[PDB]
Amino acid sequence: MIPFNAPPVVGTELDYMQSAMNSGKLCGDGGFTRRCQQWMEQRFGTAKALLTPSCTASLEMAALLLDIQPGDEVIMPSYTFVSTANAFVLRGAKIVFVDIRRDTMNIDETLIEAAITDKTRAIVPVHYAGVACEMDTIMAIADKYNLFVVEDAAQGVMSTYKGRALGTIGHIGCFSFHETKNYTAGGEGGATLINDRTLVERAEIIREKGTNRSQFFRGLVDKYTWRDIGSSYLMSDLQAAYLWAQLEAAERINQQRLALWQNYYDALLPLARAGRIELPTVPADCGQNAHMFYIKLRDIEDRSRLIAWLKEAEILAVFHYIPLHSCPAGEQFGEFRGEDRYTTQESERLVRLPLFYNLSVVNQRTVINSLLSYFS
Ligand SMILES: [Cl-]
Ligand SMILES: [Cl-]
Ligand SMILES: [Cl-]
Known part of the structure; x- marks a missing residue:
């Protein structure tokens, strides 16, 4: 029986997970998390890479990062995975669907502007099949209307557009490491990529349960406190070790x-x-x-x-x-x-x-x- 998919197996995952278990630190933000995040920052170029439990969680984190409010409009294709829409609806957004192009099944960049209103706050291009949307056109539209752009790059790890790594072009990019994608963090995972440098600090707060914990570990505050609404967008270091084996390959x-x-x-x-x-x-x-x-x-x-x-x-x-x-x-x-x-x-x-x-x-x-x- 020839299946449609089998998860990637490199042959070093067990060794790396055993090493992670020898350190005795398996929770998020551990040694292998840092290794994977530094690798994405060095090779792809984002300001901050942050490992999450899923691309779905990364998309939710981005909607929350952007302070989406009830009634805000978010432009995205109808031909995409349900999570692209859910992430923003959870924050109360109305979704504005735009037709796709026939040749690539990506959102038609020549149709996005006609859908913009005074309630529009963001555009979410989806790089279907790892083939980039027409990003230069989309960024120019967003800049003209002061909109955030969130790449759903779930399918686009190692893809590029004019030499630039997918997920590093919009203000925020999201990767998936589900077992059906190109690289897997032990079955499930994701990454949020912060490319707008002005958003890094808020991203770290909402990822760390609404606290300035990361700022405390940096030595900038005596103690950290609960200062915003947040969530837990952490991958286990066990999964980050599985992912590292794949990213090394x-x-x-x-x-x-x-x-x-x-x-x-x-x-x-x-x-x-x-x-x-x-x-x-x-x-x-x-x-x-x-x-x-x-x-x-x-x-x-x-x-x-x-x-x-x-x-x-x-x-x-x-x-x-x-x-x-x-x-x-x-x-x-x-x-x-x-x-x-x-x-x-x-x-x-x-x-x-x-x-x-x-x-x-x-x-x-x-x-x-x-x-x-x-x-x-
Ligand atoms: Cl045959
Ligand atoms: Cl045909
Ligand atoms: Cl903006």
């Missing part, structure tokens, strides 16, 4: 996934040039991370038939997002501005193929040959 993993990605593209390009399917687009300025390999079929019937075909060959391929805006909570918490030209239509024909670090070359060729048989 960051390029190894990235290069393996990219090579696998390119075998899919080579094999399926003829079916695309014949117009039977559509393959992913990777715009010139975008350095992808092979988070997924998706294809688009004619419609949901074509998609369903291919998935059930692959299932009968014991290959697990899956579709992705259902548009948030036409879900019951989406109609309650948000509105879709402008026409839904591509969000529903394109979501209904997209299928994702098995892709993961340890996917064998033999299993991959089995997937390819089953696909070719279906279209033959």
Whole structure:
């Protein structure tokens, strides 16, 4: 049985976790947390990297960091994971959905400005499949209207846009280390990346349960106190040690996934040039991370038939997002501005193929040959 995903395994995780257990300090903000956060700061360039329990928690932390208030409007795609919306609705935001581009399934940057109102406070681009949104256009829009930009870079660890690491471009960026993403912190995890230097101090306060604890450890105050509403956005140092093993192998993993990605593209390009399917687009300025390999079929019937075909060959391929805006909570918490030209239509024909670090070359060729048989 060929699964859709298997978590990355590097072969050093156990050793690093054992080392963490030898230190006797497994709670958050430990030695391996510092190592991972320093690595992201050094290699990606953010002002502060902060490990969290999940990308969901990182997104919630960003909404709280931005002091989102009831009635504030947050612009985001409808074609994204539910947590992108929840994080802001939890702070009372109304969600303003904007259609996606057909070529990359990312929010259409040429549609964001038309959705801005005097209540708009932030824009949340989602880098679908590790392919960056058109960030220069989005930052220019946000600066013209004095909006925060929050990157949902859950799928974009090691991705770049014009040489810049995804997650370091907006004011705040969020990573996911769930076992289905490129790197995993032992099953679950996330990171908030603070790129606006004026937000670092507040980020440290809300992450530390609303206290100026980090400021006390720095020696700037005699004692710390409860000074704001906060939460606990901490990863265990056990999970940070698992993550470190993976981050130490960051390029190894990235290069393996990219090579696998390119075998899919080579094999399926003829079916695309014949117009039977559509393959992913990777715009010139975008350095992808092979988070997924998706294809688009004619419609949901074509998609369903291919998935059930692959299932009968014991290959697990899956579709992705259902548009948030036409879900019951989406109609309650948000509105879709402008026409839904591509969000529903394109979501209904997209299928994702098995892709993961340890996917064998033999299993991959089995997937390819089953696909070719279906279209033959
Ligand atoms: Cl601003
Ligand atoms: Cl097509
Ligand atoms: Cl085969």
